[PDB]
């Protein structure tokens, strides 16, 4: 169907794929922290950083669009991924935005989706089209809407990893989940007319400030599938209610020791560890193709 570098072109066309910067969620900033587990996430994975421990944790939040001058009050999503570091030195990557669902069971959709929503030029009558073609996603405009809300911070917005990943622990027995990365301030945010009056980088201002005022705390929720919930389909809405909190994410500050020199920071859905394995989900497996591309086109270097 569609290759890696078909999707970087279709981003490039619609404003994305920059000199240097990651080709979607160019702008963003990285945080320090760590994450901590509760007593029984062990029963539902065997992964390291699910034991209970502290382990490490990197943060970027980011804004979905491919330029990295977009302004924070505009609409659009967010993105919160997180890298834990395990005690042998791995890591392991969970990526989440503020979507409910994905807006395409495929990544055909998803990128037809993205040039549908291209220039100003005829956007309505393109989206209008694209509904036409894509029912289901005509059935959720509000979560389309939901989607694109102007946070009144990075820490007052809930984000989602959308894809089904299947965790299994130490006894054998496993579950499928999706993840929740939900605040623990409340959640809040900003009308069009306050937005519009905000610096393009207030939420990054807003967050420094915050953080010098204390630590920002996000809880890690995981959403187990039900008898009829798909694990293949992230557009595929989920009747389960059974919906768990693992571990707790805290951020103390922005860092500084990362992305300096040769390094290289890639948050990869498809970067898990023992005790969790991805779903067949054909947008998630897609993703780590794109990345690499994307990562290749701002560094030099490919994998
Ligand atoms: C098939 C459709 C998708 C494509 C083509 C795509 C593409 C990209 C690209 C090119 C980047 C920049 C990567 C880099 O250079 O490091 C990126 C970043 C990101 N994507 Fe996707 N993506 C897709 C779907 C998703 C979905 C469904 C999620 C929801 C969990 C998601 C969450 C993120 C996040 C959170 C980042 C931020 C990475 C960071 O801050 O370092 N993406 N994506």
Redesign the pocket.
């Known amino acids: 169907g569609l290759t890696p570098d078909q999707?970087?072109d279709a981003?490039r066309g619609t404003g994305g794929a920059q000199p240097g910067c990651?080709?979607?969620?160019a702008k963003?900033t990285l945080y320090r922290g760590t994450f901590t587990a509760t007593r029984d996430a062990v029963m539902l994975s065997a992964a390291p950083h699910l034991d209970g421990s502290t382990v490490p944790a990197l943060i970027?939040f980011?804004n979905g669009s491919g330029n990295p001058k977009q302004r924070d009050g505009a609409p659009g999503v967010r993105?919160?991924?997180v890298k834990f570091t395990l005690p042998d030195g791995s890591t392991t990557d969970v990526?989440?935005?503020t979507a409910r669902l994905?807006v395409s069971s495929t990544?055909e959709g998803?990128?037809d989706l993205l040039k549908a929503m291209r220039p100003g030029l005829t956007t309505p009558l393109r989206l209008a089209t694209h509904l036409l073609t894509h029912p289901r996603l005509l059935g959720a405009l509000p979560l389309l809407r939901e989607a694109n809300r102007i946070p009144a911070s990075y820490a007052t917005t809930e984000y989602?990893?959308?894809?089904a990943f299947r965790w299994i622990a130490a006894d054998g027995s496993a579950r499928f989940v999706r993840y929740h990365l939900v605040p623990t301030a409340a959640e809040e945010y900003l009308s069009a007319s306050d937005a519009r009056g905000k610096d393009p980088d207030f939420l990054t201002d807003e967050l420094a400030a915050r953080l010098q005022d204390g630590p920002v705390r996000f809880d890690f929720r995981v959403q187990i599938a039900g008898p009829t919930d798909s694990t293949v389909d992230?557009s595929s809405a989920w009747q389960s209610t059974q919906i768990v909190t693992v571990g707790t994410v805290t951020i103390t500050g922005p860092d500084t020791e990362r992305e300096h020199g040769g390094d290289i920071?890639?948050?990869d859905?498809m970067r898990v560890t023992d005790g969790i394995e991805p779903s067949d989900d054909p947008?998630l497996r897609?993703?780590t193709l794109?990345?690499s591309a994307?990562?290749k086109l701002?560094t030099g270097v490919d994998r």
């Open positions: 999707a970087i981003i990651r080709a979607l969620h963003g970027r980011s993105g919160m991924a990526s989440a935005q994905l990544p998803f990128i989602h990893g959308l894809h992230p920071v890639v948050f859905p947008v897609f993703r794109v990345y994307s990562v701002r």
